[model samples]
Target: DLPIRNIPGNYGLPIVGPIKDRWDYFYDQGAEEFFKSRIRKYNSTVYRVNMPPGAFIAENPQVVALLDGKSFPVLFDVDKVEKKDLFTGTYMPSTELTGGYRILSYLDPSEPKHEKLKNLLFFLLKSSRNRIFPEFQATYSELFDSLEKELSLKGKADFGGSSDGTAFNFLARAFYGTNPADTKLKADAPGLITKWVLFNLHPLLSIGLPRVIEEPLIHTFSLPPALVKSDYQRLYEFFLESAGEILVEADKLGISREEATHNLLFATCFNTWGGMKILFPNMVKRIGRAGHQVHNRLAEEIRSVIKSNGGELTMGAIEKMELTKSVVYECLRFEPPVTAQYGRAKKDLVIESHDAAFKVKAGEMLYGYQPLATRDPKIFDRADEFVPERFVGEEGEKLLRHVLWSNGPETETPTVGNKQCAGKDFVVLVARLFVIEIFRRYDSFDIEVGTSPLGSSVNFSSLRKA
Candidate 1:
């Protein structure tokens, strides 16, 4: 048995667990606080956090590195583990949603089928759909026009105001044609999309458990009665309606192979836009000093690019801006939108790295501390500082090693491979456009200091002009 160290006692509460107090921990005490507290008191580097279904926390990178797919791909096997068996009943019905159906297929780990779907996504995103510039330009123009009107009327607005969510909405419309202004269906789509994406990644029920008892419990306790019933109905109905639309349109248009291909493309945009909404504010904030410097740089780049391209920032033009590209990379490195990646060990394995060696048992869930590795002092000097130019020149190569979006040994920058985020280029384009438009039209704005004291992190909300 490992020796126990004395730390603060955890008073267990019901379903919420200790989440209430720890909500601000990342901002208050920093990432190390949660892991270090356990280490200091228990004399152990790994411990089971008090959350339900028991998640293991590993502070050591050596152990964390072992969780990468190259070393243990079986840990991420979702097909073998039944979704209804984990956590609480909160997400059992998600499988019935339109977005959920697509996401579950994406998350399924069964070999040949999973590989085919991933390859289809990669081809569409990186190779076939090279003309994404038109959509990028259109989306940026819409955001700029919308923000310009709002600023003219109000004289001032919060940076984090509804604009971030609006930016996400514009992206969704551009990519998937999901009109955010449709009041009748607006509220339901975003929430339904988010629930579908998140549940597929980490289901709330126990793995491998039967759902007979759980389904009823989920219905009873998971969501407010009104939301549970209405949302389920809305999502399922929308999916059927959408699929029908695709069928009818395809039939009328003669169902060309290219058109069918693009339809599948829309399926990916559903989750990509949802991820951007949740991830972009924190990402953009990291690029500027109090958020202004980054805005200035983005504006300068866009203006120059537009001039060079005859007063139009076309998708092609936006793609060539090196400095803007660096800023986006830096933001991702400093504050990755997806903070933790999980994998389970398929077989007993020993991890051998330059730093240290460790062993993990079969069936153990390994959570890679991505945020920690990105900021590791050993890897990045002044790792906490936001250095937009960090990816420039010779230093750029060094920055790649800090990424974890892929499998294998930690490289300076790694592709997610079959798991690569399909919307990477799209995200960069939208962000560049937003930053440029904001700076070109507005001279100044106020930023809400995040609740966390370190100032290394942020959650955007715009300030009202006095």
Candidate 2:
């Protein structure tokens, strides 16, 4: 039998502790270092801490910090943890922001409505499978053209901003058969999505303000949904107008059209689009930082696969680019786009880290900082470094289960029974498409990396020809 241990660490006084921790989290040590410092102090991957955005209205800012591969999976087990209202960590954005409904992401699998909404999302993605490649190819080709034009005209191209549009447009096209740029929503949809995502997720984010100004205000309360209603309404209108067939399918699965439109808006804009906004730049930054040899290998493998498939970027062809797939997984492991996973323990359970088992109580919130978990040194060697070929073979395939960026093991397919992102495979496919697209167009590229409110901000300083 494993020896049980009390989770160490402490949540100081009511308002004082969370605000102090919030400061460390957002400013003092930064998000990653905050976890590392606490782990060092407590000497335990599973401990207690006051998660940020903890003041005033958040129900409970307290969480059992799960910081390793072993304990983090507890958050993924639906039967053991109640996932309702914990999607955004300690607090949830008001359902009003999502058109007066708790979308699929916020619902627990045990809820009766969960299966219906989840199935609706499953149908949406499955139906779009055949369209993903063509729509992605079309949109990204335009993106590359814009990048090249900007590079020649202005001496540089900002991949982050350009990718925002492509992510939004391609998702609109592939899933709804409408290019948002061609519609009344033209060109500005990405900016609108950015605003909408911000207002809803402001509680969980830090825009790098002085802690005195930021911690008290932003963390204390969510940005009023009313402020973004107009922005959100416009997005809702676009989704409703463009996704007629998808709404009908949602109806078939016992989801109402209005609610369906809202969920689709959330699924597309906040979940998938928001993710791509972060994923692409990070992938590019990693590859760019990996240097010329990595670039040459990636290009050679991609080109060899394309030639063997008779100059097609088919699924089989993409599948053969083992190095490309590994790079994407490596990027996800190194800096997962979505870093927070939360759940409320349904019953008292013992969670294990690499060293010991800790007893968790029912009703306690569990927060797993994914970077710490996926990069747990006990599981991954040189965990801090971005190893492009990390997940390349049979042994690498075994490591897929520990890549928890998609809210579940990478090896597992998402389903209604799980809380994994419905578009998990779609995200991976699109990320791979991005690497392939860029490598196909340019032999190598150089980028300068920084941070934006979203994820890595990357500028293409050079794009050398193939």
CA lDDT of each prediction against the hidden true structure: 0.45, 0.87
lDDT tens per residue, model 2, 333-428: 999898989989999988988778988889988999999988989999999999999999899879998898899999898888889888888889
TM-score of each: 0.65, 0.98
lDDT of each residue in 78-172, candidate 1, tens digit only: 42222221212112223333323333223434433344444444444553243345554565556556545655676543344444445445544
lDDT: worst 10-residue window of model 2: 210-219
lDDT of 2: 0.87
Residue 241, candidate 2: C-alpha displacement in angstroms? 1.1
Off by over 4 Å in 2: none
